[model samples]
Target: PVDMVQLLKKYPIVWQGLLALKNDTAAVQLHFVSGNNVLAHRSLPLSPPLRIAQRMRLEATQLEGVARRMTVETDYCLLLALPCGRDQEDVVSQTESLKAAFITYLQAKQAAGIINVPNPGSNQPAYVLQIFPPCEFSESHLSRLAPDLLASISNISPHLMIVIASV
Candidate 1:
């Protein structure tokens, strides 16, 4: 993880998307921004674990020189992973907590008028949720976890895809 102070130094391009969103009303007229559409639609409270994941991703990507590594898995989902810079709990515990919290967040979004449960397949872009597990997890554990995560995602947005990672 890059130092928080150091990360802040990278400006301009780092905040391009965010600034565009704020300054450009025409951008919103385009019918939802590229990456933040889902988040903008949500009206639910984020769970702790899910919030952590979002924070980590945002911090890592928003900062300079903190290249967020992404991989495209065979299942057609993107895998995002970053080294633990500070927060270091047991891997299993952290993973489980993150999953559960994300599920709760999805549920809350479903309950709210934030997102359509069925998903707008016609006009909206097609994308899916994927669990990016650490390489250490056993195949069996991944097999079990991936399905459950997919199921949970389906419950929230039927069109949302879920892909399991492979070593």
Candidate 2:
């Protein structure tokens, strides 16, 4: 098995990126989800966050870098993966402004080196980045977005890269 803890010790870039979210307005959990296991997790106790985490094991079923969102009742969940190569640029372009933000979050993690850039034909992973309502927001941040704000994941991936960061 790919020991995630060792991977972190090798290069804990994700940890640095998580620090970015704590100081920013975006309140989202960063989870490195693999098949039936959470490789890495930096989350909060927001209203029904992706704590269950098991669902993402299902999402681990996209071959490319794409960003998607969905709502489980009140909270919003976003899935993102870095496509093999530069396709993520195109994938993000296809999305509307809102969902597209997920890519930037991915990019932040990328810059942090949590996950390397997509290589040609090397499958990418997906993330279950969820958002929460302002009233209930912890070790996580998914808090406070207007009603219209509460809306939006797509074709999962192998890795489901989960980290939070930005330029």
Candidate 3:
């Protein structure tokens, strides 16, 4: 019989190559990577683990240079920033279609105590929308959908904040 262990030892490079290929397949083709046998992707449905990371990144980006401490101990949040001291009525008016839908959702959430009122002195409301991706594309799926996602956001809102963090 063949010495299997010795054969593998001698073909270490082959094993390494296969491993790299495996990792790359998920990272490139599937928009996710695995760690310790767990697989993750960007478009994967929202779960507790993914939510924690998303919220962290959002908070970090929003509080980048703020003097006041802000915390988002939640799963996810959306931040919209417009030019400071600029007239936003026109922009909001232009995107009334999307704005309308957003407001309707916001109202329901607010009534349910799921959302907080917008903070005064802020350029725009930091709407925390929970985006739970489907089980299929959960995790770094952003890597795959980044182009289309950014394009869609740009079409609706000129400036938007997107944050992704590793769990």
Best by TM-score: 1
Q: Model 1: which ten-residue window has the lowest total lDDT?
A: 12-21
Query: Using TM-score as the measure, what is the rank order of every candidate, best first?
Result: 1, 2, 3
Model 1 clash number: 1
Ten contiguous residues minimizing lDDT sum, candidate 3: 14-23
Off by over 4 Å in 2: 1-25, 29-33, 36-38, 41-160, 163-167
Per-candidate TM-scores read 0.20, 0.19, 0.19
lDDT of 2 by residue, 15-98 (tens): 212212222222232332222222232222222212211111112212112122222221222212222223556434333221
Please state every model's RMSD to the true fold in angstroms: 16.9, 17.4, 19.9
Which one wins on lDDT?
Answer: 2
Query: Residue by residue across 7-55, what tens digits does model 1's lDDT show?
Result: 2132101111100111121000011112232332331122111111221
Q: Candidate 1: where is the Cα deviation over 4 Å?
A: 1-75, 78-96, 99-122, 130-167
lDDT value, residue 111 of candidate 2: 25
Q: Per model, state how many residue pairs clash.
A: 1, 15, 15
Question: Would you list the C-alpha lDDT of every candidate in the order shown?
Answer: 0.24, 0.25, 0.25
- Tens-place lDDT per residue, model 3, 17-68, is 0001111210001111112112122223322111211221223343342212
